Amino acid sequence: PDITATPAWDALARHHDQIGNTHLRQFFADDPGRGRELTVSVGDLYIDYSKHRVTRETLALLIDLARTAHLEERRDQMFAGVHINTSEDRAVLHTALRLPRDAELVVDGQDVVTDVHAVLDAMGAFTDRLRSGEWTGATGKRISTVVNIGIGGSDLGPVMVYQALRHYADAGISARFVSNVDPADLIATLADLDPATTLFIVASKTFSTLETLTNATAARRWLTDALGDAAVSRHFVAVSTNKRLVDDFGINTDNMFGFWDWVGGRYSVDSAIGLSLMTVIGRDAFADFLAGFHIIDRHFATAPLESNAPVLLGLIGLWYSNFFGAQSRTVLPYSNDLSRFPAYLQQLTMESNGKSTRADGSPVSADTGEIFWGEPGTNGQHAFYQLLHQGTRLVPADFIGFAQPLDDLPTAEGTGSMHDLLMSNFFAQTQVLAFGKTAEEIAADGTPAHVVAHKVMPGNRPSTSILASRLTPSVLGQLIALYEHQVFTEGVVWGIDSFDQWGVELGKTQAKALLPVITGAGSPPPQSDSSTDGLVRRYRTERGRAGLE
Amino acid sequence: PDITATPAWDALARHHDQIGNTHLRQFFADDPGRGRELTVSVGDLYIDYSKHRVTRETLALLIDLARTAHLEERRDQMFAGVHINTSEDRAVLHTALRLPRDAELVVDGQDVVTDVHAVLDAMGAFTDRLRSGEWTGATGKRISTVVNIGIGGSDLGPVMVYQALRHYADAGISARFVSNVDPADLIATLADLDPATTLFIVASKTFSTLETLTNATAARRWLTDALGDAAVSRHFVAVSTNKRLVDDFGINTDNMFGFWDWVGGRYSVDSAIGLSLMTVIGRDAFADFLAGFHIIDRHFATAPLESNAPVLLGLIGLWYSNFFGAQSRTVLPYSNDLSRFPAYLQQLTMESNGKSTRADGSPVSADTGEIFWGEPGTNGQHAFYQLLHQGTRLVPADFIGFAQPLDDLPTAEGTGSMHDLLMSNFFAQTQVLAFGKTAEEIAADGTPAHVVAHKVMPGNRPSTSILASRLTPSVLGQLIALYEHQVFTEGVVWGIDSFDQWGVELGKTQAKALLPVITGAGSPPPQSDSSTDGLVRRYRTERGRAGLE
C-alpha cells in the first residue's frame, strides 16, 4: 500500500509542522541527556545521532512509520531468502556471504553456506599460492602486482577496500584497478608494469561486460606480446560464473571464482569480487572483514527498533529527505585511507534507491533515494564546508572517524599527534555545524560591525558522528553493513525494490546503436533529435572523418 | 537590491508556471532547429545546451534577469580590478594571471602584468633547471619526483591538473600531493620514495597553514634524517608570500614563488600554485594552459549575452536551482584523466556561492549555490546513473567529452576504437536522459507486461554537452575558465560575494580549542553540549587515555 497515505505518515507531517523550524540549540536545551542517550554502541562503533533535528517523540513516530511498513517482517524475509527482489523474482542474500561456516541456510534447494565457503576456501588456496610464491609467472618470477578489471560493483568495492586497508597489505604485492572503457585507464595503469610479475583479475558475472572484456582483451594482448600465447593461464584469473567464456578467454577454469545471482553488484565486495583484497591482506584478514559485516547483520536482525542502528539512521535520513526536502546526504570520513568510501556509498545508495516505482510497479507518491556525495575529512573541509556552513542547502552529514591511528606523526613542534589534530577537526565541525554562531556572539569577538553579517553561522546543520575504535578489516566490514541496512530500511518504508537496476539497460543498447553512426563510412542519417544529430556531426568532423561531409 | 523582487524575476516565475512541467520531447518537437541554434562554438569547445528545459523565450527572460543584475558592468569591474570582493575590500584578479605579456593593467598602483610574468619567468627558470638536471639533490642525483604539499586551493588544482595533463608529462619527473593532516597521507605518499631524488613544493600563502606546515615539517624530518640538515635548501621550495617564514623553514628565499591577495585559493591553479604542473609539463605547455583561460576570458568579456557561453550556462543553472528547486548539479567528464575534475569544481562552485548573505550583508531571499558532484564517464554510469534515470531527483548534468583521443586501443575484435566506445556512451546517455522511453515503447519491445513499469524511463532529465576537440593544456584552461565565469554570473545575479569564505574560520578556531580537551591530562570539563561531551569522552577512553576516567 502507499506509505504516504497511512496515519503514521500524516502524524509525521503534523509533527514536522511543529518542530520543522526548531534550532538544534533548543533541541539540546530541552533535552540535556540526548548526548548520551541518542547513541548506539555496536561492535567497534560508537554512533552518536544526537545532533539531529529530532525529539524523542520524532524517533517514536519514525519508528511507527517503520512498523506500519513491516520493516521487521521484510528484514526477516531477506535473511531467510524469500524473493524480495520482486521485479526480477530473486533472492537477496549478500548477507549470506559473511555467515560463519557452521551457519544453517538452505534456499530454493541450494545450501548457500556450503557454496559460499567452498568459494572462500578456493580463494584462500589460490591466494596463499600468490603470497607465498608457489604461483609464478610465465617466466620464473613471483607476482608483485595484481590488477583488477571490472566496472561498477566489480570496481568501486575492490578499489575503496584496497585503499582503506592499505596498512594491512603484508605480502609485498600491490593492486591496481582498471574500469573505464576510456583506453587512457588501461594505458596509464600498465605503463610501468612488468608483465612477468603482473597478474590480472577479470571480474564479471557474465564475462560478457563490454568495458571489462574490452579492457581484458587489450591487457591480454599486452601480456602475450611480451610473454607469449601460452602465458595466459598463469597471468589471468576470473571472478565470473560463465565457465565457457572464461575458457576460452584462455583462463584455466579452476582459476575461476564464482558468485551467485542473489548477490547484487553493489553488494558484491564481500564475495569473490573481493579476490584482489584477499590477495594483498590474506584469507585471515579477509575473514575478519566478513566477520565485521556479520556483527552488524546480527545486530540488525536482533536489536529492537528503538536501539537498532541501521534502522534509526535510515529513518532519520528519510525524515530529512521526505519531510524537509533535503535532496542529498554527505559522508565525510576523517581518514585518507577511506578517501574512496563516499564514492562506494554512491553506488550502494543511489543505484539501490534511485527508483520511481514501488515493488508492485505502481508510481511513488513521494521522493525516494537521496543523492550521496563526499570527500575524506580535512580535504573536504577546505573544499566545500563553506557551503555546508553558510549555504542555503540542508545537507545531513555523516562524520566517520577512528579513535586510534594505525601510524602517527608528531605535530610541528615535535610533540603531540597529527592524528589528534585530525580528530580535533572531527569533533569541532559537527559542533559548529549544529549550533553555529550569532551576530551578537561575533560582535563580542571584536569584528567590525559591517563585517559581522558575513561571518554569521546560522547552524542547525545536522550530523551523525560515527567513532570507530580503529580502522581494521572488521571495522570496515561493520561500516559497509551499517550502510547496506540503512539503504534497506529506507527502501522498505518507500515500498520500492532496492535490489534491481533496470534504469541502466537503455543507455547500453542506445550506445550500441549510436556506435555505427559515429564510426561508419559516409554521413549518418537524420538522428532521433537535433541535439544528438548536431553532436554526432561535430564529433565526426573533429575525429578527422568528415572530409567530404 | 533584492533580485527576487524585480519584474525580471516575477516574469520568470510566471514563465515557469507555464512550461515547468513541459517534457523535452515536446520542447524538441516545437523547436526543430534548437540542436543547431542553442549551441556555442568557442575556442576548442563545442557547447550544446539544447537538451535543457528552455524555450527561446526562457533564454531571453533569463538574459533579462542578468541585465537587471548588471552582469556586464560587474564583469567589466572585475577585469578592471575594482574591489568587488566587498566583505574583504579587495580586487578579484585571477583573470590577470593569464594575460599576455604585452597586456596593459595597473590596479591600486600595482603593475600586475609585470608582476605576474616576473613570477612566471622565475618559475620557468627554476623548473627548466629541474627538467634538465642542472638542479640536483643533496647527493648528486637529479630530481625524479616532485611532491606538493597544500590543502584546498593549494591541492585540488595541482592534483586535478596533473592527472588531466598526464599525457604531457615529458621530462621523466612525476608528481605526488599530500593534503590531509591525517598522517596516513604523508606516510603513504613517502613510503617508496628516495629522499635523494625527491623535492618538495610547500604551497601556502601565509606559510602558517596548520595542515600544510605540519605535513611539511614532518617531510623535512624525513628528508633530513636521510640527507642531513643542510640538504633542505635543494629539496624544498615554497609557493608563498611570506619571505621570513619560508626562511627560516630552511628554504632559500629566491626559491620562493609568490602570488597575490587578489587571487583566491580556489582560483589559484594558474598562478605559482601551478608550479608542480609546470615542473612536469614545462613552461611552454604551462603557457598554453594559461592561454586557454584567456580565450574564454576574452569571450566572456566581449561576446553578447545572447551568445555568451559562461553566462548562458550560469543562467540555465540558476533556472533549475531557483525555479525548479534542483539542489545539485552533476559534472560527468568522459575521460579517466579528468577523474578529479568534479572534485575541483566542488570547491570552485560551492566555496564561491555557498552563501546566505548579499554583498551588502543583507539576507538572501532565495537559494544561492548548488551542490556540485560527479565522477568520470563510464565509471559514474555504472555507479549512480540508475538514480539519474529512474530517480525522483532533478539533477541537471554537464557531459564533458573529447573528440580526438590522445592514445587509443582497438575493441575486443582487434578493430575499431575503444575511444569510440567511450563516446558512443557520451552521446547516448544525454539522449536517453532527455527523452526516456514510455510504457508503450517498452511493451513494443516484448517485455512482460508486469515488468514494464519498472523499466519505464520518464526522461526530462536535462544536460549540457561540451565536446572539446582534444584534451590539451589549452583546452583544460578553457574548461576551468568556463566554470569560473558561470560561478561569476550566478553570484552576480544573486548579489552575493562569491570571492570570500568566512564560513571556514570558526571551524578552525574551534578545533584549536577542542585539541587540549582530547589531548590533555585529566578529565575534560563539561563541554558546550552533551554530544561533543560524550564524543570527547569516548575518544579519550578509546585512545588509551581514560584509565582513571
Side-chain angles (χ1 to χ4, degrees), chain A residues 51 332 334 377-379 381-382 385 389 399-401 417-433 465, chain B residues 180-182 210-211 504-515 518 532 535 539:
Chain A
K51 299 200 198 64
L332 311 166
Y334 277 58
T378 280
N379 287 7
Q381 216 167 276
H382 305 284
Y385 282 36
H389 289 299
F399 284 68
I400 307 178
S417 164
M418 287 186 60
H419 187 260
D420 288 319
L421 292 185
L422 207 220
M423 295 306 277
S424 71
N425 291 96
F426 176 85
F427 301 118
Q429 286 296 331
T430 60
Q431 184 174 49
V432 166
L433 282 164
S465 287
Chain B
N180 210 326
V181 78
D182 178 359
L210 219 207
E211 293 91 329
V504 303
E505 194 191 292
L506 181 55
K508 281 177 258 201
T509 64
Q510 194 63 27
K512 180 190 282 291
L514 248 39
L515 181 63
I518 61 179
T532 103
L535 284 161
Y539 181 78

Side-chain angles (χ1 to χ4, degrees), chain A residues 13 16 51 62 81 108 119 141 174 185 187 211 213 240 245 252 277 305 326 348 351 368 399 422 442 476 487 515 542:
Chain A
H16 181 271
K51 299 200 198 64
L62 285 163
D108 295 358
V119 180
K141 329 227 268 186
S174 64
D185 186 349
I187 291 176
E211 293 91 329
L213 267 193
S240 186
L245 286 175
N252 201 190
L277 183 68
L305 267 36
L348 172 53
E351 198 175 71
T368 49
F399 284 68
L422 207 220
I442 286 150
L476 190 60
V487 162
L515 181 63
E542 216 62 52

Side-chain angles (χ1 to χ4, degrees), chain A residues 181 183 210 213-215 217-218 221 515 519, chain B residues 408-422:
Chain A
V181 78
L210 219 207
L213 267 193
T214 299
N215 272 316
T217 170
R221 214 142 29 202
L515 181 63
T519 275
Chain B
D408 205 359
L409 264 27
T411 70
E413 34 276 332
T415 53
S417 164
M418 287 186 60
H419 187 260
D420 288 319
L421 292 185
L422 207 220

Side-chain angles (χ1 to χ4, degrees), chain A residues 125-133 135-141 143-242 244-419:
Chain A
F126 163 70
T127 204
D128 281 341
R129 293 178 62 201
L130 287 186
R131 336 220 311 146
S132 73
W135 183 292
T136 49
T139 65
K141 329 227 268 186
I143 304 305
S144 71
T145 310
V146 144
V147 19
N148 188 263
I149 316 185
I151 82 288
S154 299
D155 172 78
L156 290 186
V159 54
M160 177 276 281
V161 129
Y162 171 75
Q163 285 186 214
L165 303 176
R166 148 213 147 257
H167 185 81
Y168 303 87
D170 65 344
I173 122 140
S174 64
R176 301 183 180 196
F177 306 85
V178 176
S179 46
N180 210 326
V181 78
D182 178 359
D185 186 349
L186 212 190
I187 291 176
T189 64
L190 261 43
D192 62 329
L193 291 187
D194 182 358
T197 59
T198 299
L199 178 143
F200 292 95
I201 293 169
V202 31
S204 89
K205 178 72 155 72
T206 58
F207 218 74
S208 297
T209 318
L210 219 207
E211 293 91 329
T212 307
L213 267 193
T214 299
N215 272 316
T217 170
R220 184 225 269 159
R221 214 142 29 202
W222 175 84
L223 192 288
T224 291
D225 287 352
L227 264 32
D229 232 285
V232 176
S233 66
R234 65 182 60 191
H235 287 268
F236 279 84
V237 303
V239 181
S240 186
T241 221
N242 186 317
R244 164 193 88 83
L245 286 175
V246 164
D247 200 28
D248 35 35
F249 181 88
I251 295 172
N252 201 190
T253 283
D254 45 28
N255 292 324
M256 195 202 135
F257 313 85
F259 64 105
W260 311 264
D261 291 316
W262 40 256
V263 34
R266 59 195 175 269
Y267 294 93
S268 75
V269 78
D270 38 318
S271 78
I273 293 294
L275 182 65
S276 64
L277 183 68
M278 182 183 288
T279 299
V280 314
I281 69 166
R283 80 228 281 332
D284 288 343
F286 196 83
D288 296 346
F289 181 52
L290 300 193
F293 288 88
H294 191 252
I295 288 158
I296 298 302
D297 290 342
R298 189 95 183 100
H299 165 93
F300 179 42
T302 70
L305 267 36
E306 280 78 20
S307 297
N308 196 310
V311 171
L312 288 160
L313 265 22
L315 287 173
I316 287 174
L318 193 143
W319 176 234
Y320 294 124
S321 184
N322 288 291
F323 298 89
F324 291 69
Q327 291 171 192
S328 76
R329 198 208 295 193
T330 194
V331 183
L332 311 166
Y334 277 58
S335 163
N336 199 62
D337 292 335
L338 275 269
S339 67
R340 295 271 89 203
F341 194 70
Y344 180 85
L345 294 185
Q346 279 189 325
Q347 179 175 11
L348 172 53
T349 58
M350 303 165 76
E351 198 175 71
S352 293
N353 293 346
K355 308 295 213 289
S356 281
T357 283
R358 298 195 200 111
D360 66 356
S362 55
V364 297
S365 314
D367 283 322
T368 49
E370 308 90 335
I371 310 298
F372 269 68
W373 62 281
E375 287 284 349
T378 280
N379 287 7
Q381 216 167 276
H382 305 284
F384 55 75
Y385 282 36
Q386 163 64 46
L387 185 149
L388 260 32
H389 289 299
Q390 277 178 329
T392 237
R393 316 299 188 172
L394 175 66
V395 189
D398 293 354
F399 284 68
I400 307 178
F402 307 93
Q404 306 158 26
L406 266 17
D407 257 324
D408 205 359
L409 264 27
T411 70
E413 34 276 332
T415 53
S417 164
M418 287 186 60
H419 187 260

Side-chain angles (χ1 to χ4, degrees), chain A residues 35 41 48 51 182 211 321 325 327 336 356 367 382 386 390 392-393 420 503 530-531 538-539 543 545, chain B residues 35 41 48 51 182 211 321 325 327 336 356 367 382 386 390 392-393 420 503 530-531 538-539 543 545:
Chain A
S41 294
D48 174 346
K51 299 200 198 64
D182 178 359
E211 293 91 329
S321 184
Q327 291 171 192
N336 199 62
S356 281
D367 283 322
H382 305 284
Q386 163 64 46
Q390 277 178 329
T392 237
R393 316 299 188 172
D420 288 319
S530 63
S531 172
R538 178 55 91 95
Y539 181 78
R543 290 220 68 192
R545 291 182 165 152
Chain B
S41 294
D48 174 346
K51 299 200 198 64
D182 178 359
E211 293 91 329
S321 184
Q327 291 171 192
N336 199 62
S356 281
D367 283 322
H382 305 284
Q386 163 64 46
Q390 277 178 329
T392 237
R393 316 299 188 172
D420 288 319
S530 63
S531 172
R538 178 55 91 95
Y539 181 78
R543 290 220 68 192
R545 291 182 165 152

Side-chain angles (χ1 to χ4, degrees), chain B residues 78-83 89-94 96-97 99 103-119 205 241 258-263 271:
Chain B
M78 176 175 73
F79 282 102
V82 323
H83 299 209
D89 187 47
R90 40 190 208 232
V92 177
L93 287 174
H94 48 274
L97 297 171
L99 287 168
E104 303 272 55
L105 227 204
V106 56
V107 175
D108 295 358
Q110 182 191 10
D111 182 14
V112 300
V113 186
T114 288
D115 274 335
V116 162
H117 283 84
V119 180
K205 178 72 155 72
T241 221
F259 64 105
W260 311 264
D261 291 316
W262 40 256
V263 34
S271 78

